[PDB]
Design a binder for this molecule. Structure first.
Ligand SMILES: Nc1ncnc2c1ncn2[C@@H]1O[C@H](C[N@H+](CC[NH3+])CC[C@H]([NH3+])C(=O)O)[C@@H](O)[C@H]1O
Ligand SMILES: Nc1ncnc2c1ncn2[C@@H]1O[C@H](C[N@H+](CC[NH3+])CC[C@H]([NH3+])C(=O)O)[C@@H](O)[C@H]1O
Ligand SMILES: Nc1ncnc2c1ncn2[C@@H]1O[C@H](C[N@H+](CC[NH3+])CC[C@H]([NH3+])C(=O)O)[C@@H](O)[C@H]1O
Ligand SMILES: Nc1ncnc2c1ncn2[C@@H]1O[C@H](C[N@H+](CC[NH3+])CC[C@H]([NH3+])C(=O)O)[C@@H](O)[C@H]1O
Lengths: 350, 333, 333, 348
């Protein structure tokens, strides 16, 4: 539901949680300030301003007028901050959906933070693209482009954990009740959940594949159906338990390009990384090719139905999987991720 | 939304989380089996059967026919278990809301698990009471009664934990931005959050006060406005940081009465306990009396508007508070 | 106020308290005796001799004549010690303020112990500098130079101790009275308090910054306005709760240079260390630079109005703070 | 006078006084339980500080409350009067009660003018001075003040003074002979009244009480306070000095309420005060310890204390001169130990 989505972002604690992500917030601030010529005396649109922080960064960069659109009740709080920071003549908070509000004029640049898990979750990118109707023909988008990265991984424990949980139902006398008939359904449910957390990069079995969305060119409708083909050339031999997902966005300004990355090679963000499991894992040897497709289909719950089909070309062994991005499993514990066993090529005792 | 509510309970993982609470499940089973004569050859209604477990307990106790009503998709799973457990002739799953379905006959006993945090959360108690339209005049209800217990507590660490998070909004220059104008709003939000977890009973400053709901006598409408008065006789001197809440239910059967407790003196359940924090603690001395009321008003979001007003009678120190069950702080780890 | 100062130093217990600081007294004695050649057959001025201890040290080092100026009543006690130690021909107690007395001749070397908290507190340094009107050209001063050290620190416990105290004025119903309107005033007051005590150096977030006062060159008026710029290169990521202050002085003699340090890495002195708290801490990452200035303005109440302005340059996060040396928080155990 | 009022300008001290539950709670109870003395009456709060007592008076139904305050605290009180929506009932008057002007005479005066040994800080004089604004038959809250004194024995406290002074009794402190100042150091320590608490078992006789009736007394009475005493010794031993504490009474129309700082009561921010004899006196149980404690007002907002004590049966005499404005704060928080030899039955 949309109501619930906007209720979630009405809480100051959630805004705070996002603001406290230093990578995110700091990178946005740097991206805006270091490209000051894209903002000085310009007209700006902030799509989904929340607390208003990005608009304040735009004001720090010298913007003449900033329209800050916000659909949740947070809009009232942003208005309080615009007043208390004495920026009433430069920032105008507009309550409502960017799809339904009216803007007084066209803008030189649109800024937003529309990314969700594996980039697309929450389907805010559509609104962000929708807002382009207010952009002048020479206008810019901050972020300008988004890269989704995919890679196959091996993680036997993560895989087996699912069955360990579902096997609760495989008992003939739970307080006298035979639960076993539901074991299959429980297994399916667990494997339909994308897994949100981080991992050691050594579990990755091949160089990532990149899928790019150019926000200046893309159309809203483009995000209702996203087909991501992939061809992985395996670097390590073993069992492929699924695909890991992360993303980067780039702010391409007149002075410099600034990147915000959620890669597992980078410090963690509140986006972590996402893994989609194969219910049937695939064996591959170094040198093999793992080919297939990831298809994201927009649904009515502000999310996507994910279909992943993969095959090892040399053996023809196939795996097909369906996942629901709206019900991810938050697994992150804070514990340092262990590398796969058999990572020692020299004696650990030396 | 009701949609949201029933979507939450459609997941098998959630059913599993509830089922693996051994105190809960075991206490229900014992309550039913030790009172088998209340079930033997009887007609039963299971309000919100979920996986169907309570209906299976009713069947174990010899019930002749069990109508198991369930509004979520879980209903389909319960049907599978009834079939696989060879009980098609005794357990009948009725998919839908208990407020909207039709039952073939009146029942001798209603069984359910309608309790949430502080007993009243999620507002399933209303549905449970509504189901009484299907109850024969001499019929029973399992649970028969529910007691919510309140007690004042002292916990500096918790108070400062919430305060520290709220003070983020005190910053005059977060990346150059002055957030302070929202500090009052932030404190209000954080302290409206019920704190769900457990605690050592040594933090309790007075004997608990009890508020009883008799499910046999109560009417549905009664749960639209719940006024809970309290008068505590302080046993320890110190700072009262808020009120702790937990609950007991009793299954009053023909053979014996069995209690299910979520008290902090008892083994932990998936309900843990709930605490309401005061934005400013109240100082009290041993022997003082802490008086006031907890008022719950049903709202349009499947929940309650809750106000807690407490005062130290001797000094007139008053605290007024709002609690939002829609936004709990799950602190347990 | 000057009256109060000189009343304070009139008590023998205070003199005792200072004399029993063995690092201080011992370091002074070593500084003077190891550089006996700077005193042998010389004329000395002891600014604020108190008990006279430093003058006795000068006499031990072979000085021909020592003028020991003291404005408090302690002057009479010193004279008793000069007589009982049979040093009347060498130590001459001059009662009065160094700014007002008359000395018969110019001196070869000035000795004093004019340091207070953060070096500058109590404002005896300007009197010490004023005394140079009696110094022969190329004459020496013990101490010769003073280094004030600054460093950012993180200490959540201290911050919340002070914030907890300030939150008393947050109460909306203290014995029925709403105090909250004064919370802003209370927070401002408590956080204006320098925190006097020691700490583990592990709380420091960056290499200290040095500010040097050369007592041979500095002029009296210079201590009426002191501007200390600083640029810290952050070595650790975290919350900067404020700035830590300490000081060293050097006695640069002809035989050797002797240092008296009050650094937290050194044995404790009665000066401890001083910390200034920010009402709101500043977040910083390793590699960032924390820049700003500490401005001390002499006020008419024998103290300084202190302003500390600091910012995290990468984010523009600013903190402006006031410190009141007149109202310290003595925290050491 | 400047420093005195500078001290009370800080919110932290007001807070320290407010957090003393005995004091604050007892004032609140005294005022609220005697509501007929306040309901629709004209009130004067002498030295209102934060204004707390005025708020108590307002809770009790006062028609108008004049709150006089000489320190900067006056504005903080003004902020609280506005924020508590009581501007038509409470009027904050910045300035000294001796110098400001009130338009009306009042029915009752409230204040908290007590210091160490009751009299320290000399605020009672201001309090009594304020009676120029009191209607005839008007009341005083507190109405009377009782100072209690009793002889004590505390060998450790006594010997402590010499232990501290003997720092100066050494011939080569870093090469310096300090000995000549030892006598001066000893006299200095013994001039300091000792502020802290103690076990009531160190007290050697029932206290003697000196009462000041604030309804009857004049300001001038407090310039010279002569407190005669005659103790009937209950325990035998060495008498090292006199212990001091005080009570005040709020004598209302409905009931009388007491605020005590006695060592038998929970501790207050006033603690208790002990004045040492530089020469102790031996006494037997049953002997009489007679003499006088004379408090003489000085210009330092305090008193010079002269204590002359004698054991009548032996004629052993001791005299002491003390400065109440420079007391030694000795309190540490440690549970006070009773004197050794307090066991009458086997401890094992
Ligand atoms: N079509 C739309 N019209 C208006 N407002 C919208 C919106 N879609 C999302 N929002 C808000 O936009 C914010 C989203 N974001 C990120 C959430 N992952 C807030 C980012 C904020 N600008 C910041 O950087 O702190 C939230 O407050 C959302 O209610
Ligand atoms: N008015 C209503 N009509 C029908 N069904 C309802 C309902 N209100 C709740 N439910 C279901 O009842 C179950 C609740 N409970 C506990 C949730 N805290 C499960 C009870 C089950 N019998 C068990 O004990 O495992 C869930 O499946 C809910 O969808
Ligand atoms: N302008 C001045 N003219 C004369 N006397 C002064 C003075 N300023 C301070 N004093 C005294 O100097 C002493 C200071 N010092 C340091 C005290 N923090 C005494 C130290 C003494 N010399 C020692 O080392 O034992 C005190 O007695 C002060 O009254
Ligand atoms: N002649 C005088 N005229 C006006 N004000 C005076 C005063 N003498 C003392 N005060 C104030 O009285 C207060 C003292 N008292 C007690 C301190 N020992 C505070 C009482 C206050 N009403 C409370 O109970 O909190 C302080 O603010 C003092 O500046």
């Amino acid at each position: 539901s949309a109501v619930q989505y906007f209720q979630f972002y009405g809480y100051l604690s959630q805004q705070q949680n996002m603001m406290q992500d230093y990578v995110r917030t700091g990178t946005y601030q740097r991206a805006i300030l270091q490209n000051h010529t894209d903002f000085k005396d310009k007209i700006v649109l902030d799509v989904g301003c929340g607390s208003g922080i990005l608009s304040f960064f735009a004001a720090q960069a010298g913007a003449r007028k900033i329209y800050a659109v916000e659909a949740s009740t947070m809009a009232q709080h942003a208005e309080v901050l615009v007043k208390s920071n004495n920026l009433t003549d430069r920032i105008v908070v507009i309550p409502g959906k960017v799809e339904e509000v009216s803007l007084p004029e066209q803008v030189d640049i649109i800024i937003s933070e529309p990314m969700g898990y594996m980039l697309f979750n929450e389907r805010m990118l559509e609104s962000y693209l929708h807002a382009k109707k207010y952009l002048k023909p020479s206008g810019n988008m901050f972020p300008t482009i988004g890269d989704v990265h995919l890679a196959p991984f091996t993680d036997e424990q993560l895989y087996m954990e699912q069955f360990t949980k579902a096997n609760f139902w495989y008992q003939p006398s739970f307080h006298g009740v035979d639960l076993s008939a539901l074991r299959g359904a429980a297994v399916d449910e667990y494997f339909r959940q994308p897994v949100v957390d981080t991992f050691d990069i050594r579990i990755l079995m091949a160089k990532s594949v990149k899928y790019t969305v150019n926000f200046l060119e893309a159309k809203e409708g483009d995000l209702h159906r996203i087909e991501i083909p992939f061809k992985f050339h395996m670097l390590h031999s073993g069992l492929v338990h699924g695909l890991a997902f992360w993303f980067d966005v780039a702010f391409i300004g007149s002075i410099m390009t600034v990147w915000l990355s959620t890669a597992p090679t980078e410090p963690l963000t509140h986006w972590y990384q996402v893994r989609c499991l194969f219910q049937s894992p695939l064996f591959a040897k170094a040198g093999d090719t793992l080919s297939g497709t990831c298809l994201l289909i927009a649904n009515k719950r502000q999310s996507y139905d994910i279909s992943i089909v993969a095959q090892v070309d040399q053996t023809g062994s196939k795996s097909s999987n369906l996942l629901d991005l709206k019900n991810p499993f938050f697994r992150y514990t804070g514990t340092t991720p262990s590398p796969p066993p058999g990572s020692h090529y020299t004696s650990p005792s030396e």
